[PDB]
Design a binder for this molecule. Structure first.
Ligand SMILES: CNS(=O)(=O)Nc1cccc(-n2c(=O)n(C3CC3)c(=O)c3c(Nc4ccc(I)cc4F)n(C)c(=O)c(C)c32)c1
Ligand SMILES: Nc1ncnc2c1ncn2[C@@H]1O[C@H](COP(=O)(O)OP(=O)(O)NP(=O)(O)O)[C@@H](O)[C@H]1O
Ligand SMILES: Nc1ncnc2c1ncn2[C@@H]1O[C@H](COP(=O)(O)OP(=O)(O)NP(=O)(O)O)[C@@H](O)[C@H]1O
Ligand SMILES: [Mg+2]
Lengths: 308, 275
């Protein structure tokens, strides 16, 4: 933990606003705009109460009896609250789809930020790492849960400069009950997880490392660019996956980045999870120590590069 | 355009009843031909882009078929863009829900006879040059002894409907297909073959033994590599022994090199020389 006092402050100011609603229903919300396609998330206005939320829509046609099991596992999420975890407002069932209304983080995802900026500088990426490391420690130490799906599209930002995790794995029944999962073109799953073997939070550590390389260089880094392509800066899914399992992991270029940054990601992307750094080892890495003591006005950088 | 008056079966009337499930290949309704039928309703965006030409070909191909272990293909009417495929209605339970019922008692004899029936049906289809794309335990019906195969050759059609995959389906997909899988690519492009069908029969054979599918539910990506590498099926083959004769045909059907997979006529003999 090592909770600061101000972190208590900003959490508590949200949790007073928490009680500002009691019940949720479809007609409370008005669609403001479409964010992206994956589930799909919409900006919505809540009308019973002035809170503005993010509503993500997951389409499911399944029988009533299973739903009460999902919801009771899902009720635990009202208990977890952290400056590193997106605040949650409630869950309900309506017209063949669960709507999840959550805290709106005005900076969007790291994917859409990277696209606009071109590249993310080393010093910003240091501040992001600290927030992620402390979130995973909290989940391990207090609730014994791994995230299982860490990636840039599920890392949200705001203009105050807070960083919060979403879309983590709270419900064992929901995983099993979800018969049909959907794959796309980028995969952030660790090698051990891809081979269907025993896994732990270590697979999440790989996902963080790989996510950082993408954002640092501005391109999904598998396959690596060639020599002449890195100066300037149509593949099937199984070829990509087989690259992750058998080829050496991506690495940062050795010219333009510090050894602490290069060594940190390298320690995150060791394929053998027993040698991959764990949270205890990560907390003490030189790269993290430097970033933690650095004074960077992250809000100002975000507003100025995205044009407010 | 093909109509109901061109068909073997004399047509007078057909009343829709309750639907009984939706999928990426339209909606299936309990119907009434004086006999109940299954009616699959489709829409074809292929505005006469050889889709109908192929559809007329494939549907006529389904015609001239009859076998005690395969569904009776009855009719296919097309009032474009709205199409419909009328099949005989199988009473009883799917093999999926049947094998997973606790009260069911299957043995090496019941299991053998069931597999034989499936091969006899699948043999007919291969003899007619009809590749049964999409063979799985959800598309096989059991009714106090009678065994029927369903929804054959449906993937050859190019009608309207990130990758979209189920878990129950992946366990039947052979490696050659999974490697070729890529976004924006349609089902018609995948390399289904007579060999691709016998692989899916292996996952059926495994379900007949293990009363479940080979890969405990995972992220589809995991199932991709495990299947596309062939290592996954190698592990589950080693992970539990069943019997040299039983494991013989499971290692046979799931052979990584498709040419190392037996024909269905060969599988008839393998099922004879068994307990
Ligand atoms: C796909 N690989 S897998 O086969 O291994 N299955 C799997 C693995 C890892 C995560 C999930 N997963 C998930 O992807 N999403 C996103 C919809 C796209 C979830 O939202 C999700 C989830 N909802 C949720 C909870 C809190 C917040 I704040 C926001 C949320 F969206 N909850 C409760 C889960 O428990 C899991 C396990 C989820 C699925
Ligand atoms: N809470 C949110 N607020 C704003 N934008 C979001 C939010 N969640 C997701 N997005 C954006 O919209 C897209 C859809 O996200 P979502 O449907 O949650 O799946 P995903 O973020 O793409 N990855 P995953 O959630 O694991 O399937 C993402 O790529 C983000 O760019
Ligand atoms: N001839 C039939 N007799 C009885 N039930 C049938 C018949 N054909 C299809 N069904 C059922 O109708 C439902 C929908 O069919 P189908 O379109 O094949 O979806 P599915 O079998 O569940 N899997 P999918 O093909 O991916 O949608 C399923 O429950 C089938 O078992
Ligand atoms: Mg079917």
């Amino acid at each position: 933990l090592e909770l600061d006092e101000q972190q208590r402050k900003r959490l508590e100011a949200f949790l007073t606003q928490k009680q500002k609603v009691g019940e949720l229903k479809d007609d409370d919300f008005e669609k403001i705009s479409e964010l992206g396609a994956g589930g799909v998330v919409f900006k919505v206005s809540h009308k019973p109460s002035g809170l503005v939320m993010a509503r993500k829509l997951i389409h499911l046609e399944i029988k009533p009896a299973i739903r009460n099991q999902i919801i009771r596992e899902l009720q635990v999420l009202h208990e977890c609250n952290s400056p590193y975890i997106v605040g949650f407002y409630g869950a309900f069932y309506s017209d063949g789809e669960i709507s999840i209304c959550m805290e709106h983080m005005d900076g969007g995802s790291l994917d859409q930020v990277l696209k606009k900026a071109g590249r993310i500088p080393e010093q910003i990426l240091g501040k992001v790492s600290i927030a992620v490391i402390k979130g995973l420690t909290y989940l391990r130490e207090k609730h014994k849960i791994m995230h299982r799906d860490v990636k840039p599209s599920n890392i949200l930002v705001n203009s105050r400069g807070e960083i919060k995790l979403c879309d983590f794995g709270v419900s064992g029944q929901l995983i099993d009950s979800m018969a049909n999962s959907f794959v796309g073109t980028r995969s952030y799953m660790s090698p051990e997880r891809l081979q269907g073997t025993h896994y732990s939070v270590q697979s999440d550590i790989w996902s963080m490392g790989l996510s950082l390389v993408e954002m640092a260089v501005g391109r999904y880094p598998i396959p690596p660019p060639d020599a002449k392509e890195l100066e300037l800066m149509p593949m099937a899914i199984f070829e990509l996956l087989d690259y992750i399992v058998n080829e050496p992991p991506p690495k940062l270029p050795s010219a333009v980045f510090s050894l602490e940054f290069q060594d940190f990601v390298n320690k995150c992307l060791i394929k053998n999870p027993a040698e991959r750094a764990d949270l205890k080892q990560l907390m003490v890495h030189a790269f993290i120590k430097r970033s933690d003591a650095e004074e960077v006005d992250f809000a100002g950088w975000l507003c100025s590069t995205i044009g407010l | 355009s093909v109509y109901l008056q061109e068909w073997d079966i004399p047509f007078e009337q057909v009343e829709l009843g309750e639907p009984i499930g939706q999928g990426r290949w339209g909606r299936v309704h309990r119907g009434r031909w004086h006999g109940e039928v299954a009616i699959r309703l489709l829409e074809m965006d292929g505005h006469n882009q050889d889709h109908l030409k192929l559809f007329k070909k494939e549907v006529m191909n389904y015609r001239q078929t009859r076998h005690e272990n395969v569904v009776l293909f009855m009719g296919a009417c097309m009032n474009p863009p709205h199409l419909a495929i009328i099949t005989s209605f199988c009473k009883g339970r799917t093999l999926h829900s049947f094998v997973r019922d606790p009260k069911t008692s299957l043995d090496i004899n019941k299991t053998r006879q069931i597999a034989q029936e499936i091969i006899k049906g699948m043999g007919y289809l291969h003899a007619k040059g009809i590749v049964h794309k999409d063979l799985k335990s959800k598309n096989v019906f059991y009714d106090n002894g009678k065994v029927v195969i369903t929804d054959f050759g449906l993937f050859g059609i190019s009608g309207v409907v990130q990758l979209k995959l189920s878990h129950d389906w992946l366990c039947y997909l052979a490696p050659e297909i999974v490697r070729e899988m890529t976004p924006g690519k349609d089902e018609d492009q995948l390399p289904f073959s007579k060999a691709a069908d016998v692989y899916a029969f292996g996952t059926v054979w495994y379900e007949l033994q293990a009363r479940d599918w080979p890969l405990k539910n995972q992220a589809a990506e995991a199932s991709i590599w495990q299947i596309g590498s062939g290592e996954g099926m190698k592990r589950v083959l080693t992970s539990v022994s069943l019997g040299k004769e039983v494991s013989e045909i499971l290692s046979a059907c799931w052979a990584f090199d498709l040419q190392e997979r037996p024909s269905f006529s060969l599988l008839m003999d393998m099922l004879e020389k068994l307990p």
